[PDB]
Amino acid sequence: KVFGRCELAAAMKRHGLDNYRGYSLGNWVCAAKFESNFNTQATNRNTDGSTDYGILQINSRWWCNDGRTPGSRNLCNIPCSALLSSDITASVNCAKKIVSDGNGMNAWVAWRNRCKGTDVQAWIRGCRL
């Protein structure tokens, strides 16, 4: 599924991301925008053989187990396939662990390079939350 930005904002708010760890809702919507282009089924293989999965491009070296990334730490204790769901719950559960693991939202490189420090509230403009 490809989410609308407001559709996703509302779902993210329902799953507790409005100011989670001090990151306003617009930060989370913007992260999804530039990580996955709002696509719940996005996948991208990395040079190290790991793959980034889903709406928040959660990677199989550190966060989820895809069975094909030798040495996966699987810090969210979940199959990566769960993170490709049309429903964002498992991805949000895991994102809350990622964001609190040492580097804040800097874990999301696309967020760092396109979202961090910008007027991220613009990403939730007009939305019914």
The closest alpha carbon to 53, from 113, 98, 116, belongs to: 98
Instruction: Rule CB under 5 A: choose which of 37, 46, 89, 121 binds Cl ion.
Output: 121
Q: Give the binding range for Cl ion (CB under 5 A) out of 17-25, 51-59, 74-82, 94-102.
A: 17-25
Contact at 8 Å (CB) between 117 and 24?
A: no
φ, ψ of residue 85 in degrees (nearest 5): -75, 155
Catalytic residue from among 7, 18, 48, 52: 52
Q: Give the binding range for ligand PDC (CB under 6 A) out of 14-22, 50-58, 77-85, 89-97.
A: 14-22
CB of 16 to ligand PDC, least distance (A): 12
40 dihedral zone (left: phi>0; alpha: psi -120 to 50; beta): alpha
CB of 79 to Cl ion, least distance (A): 31
Task: List, by residue number, the catalytic residues.
Answer: 35, 52
